Amino acid sequence: MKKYTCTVCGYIYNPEDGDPDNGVNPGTDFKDIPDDWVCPLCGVGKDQFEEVE
Template sequence: MNLELLRKPFYLPGIPVFNFAGTLLNLERSMIMQSYRCLVCGYIYNPAEGDPDNGIEPGTAFEDIPEDWVCPECGAGKDDFEPI
């Protein structure tokens, strides 16, 4: 068994993360989720902020947004976004 693997931290969404030395790693799920940019207007979807005006709670990953969601700035669909 490779003991070096036991020294590396592991991540589970929504769960406080500790390394095997017992040190808390201050990571929130929204901090490790990726932001996306609208290719039409440049709007940035930040998962930490979500889109509360359109029913998307803070902490929602882009992948978890309903497929019929559109850019709040220009109305482009999810297909018109790229990860940044």
Template sequence: MEKYECTVCGYVYVPNVGNVTNGIDYGTAFEDLPEDWECPVCGAGKYKFDLHDDSDNSDLF
């Protein structure tokens, strides 16, 4: 599954990790997130996320 990065704060949504503290189970694809889902760090909407380029293998938060 592909990772998506918030263009506002840099948070990376990783489907294999999910967002359990906000009710998103492990393995939930970005496309399957509710339309009203927001970045858990800055509150930006899904439309503020772009496909993450992890070719540099940088750490995710």
């Protein structure tokens, strides 16, 4: 699974770690994160994230 980066602040979503404190379990692909989730550091929405190739 690919990492995604917040293009506003630089936070990296790593699917191996998830974001469990906000209900995103380890192993969750970015696309499957509920679409009301926001960056845990700066608070912007999923639409400001981009796939890390």
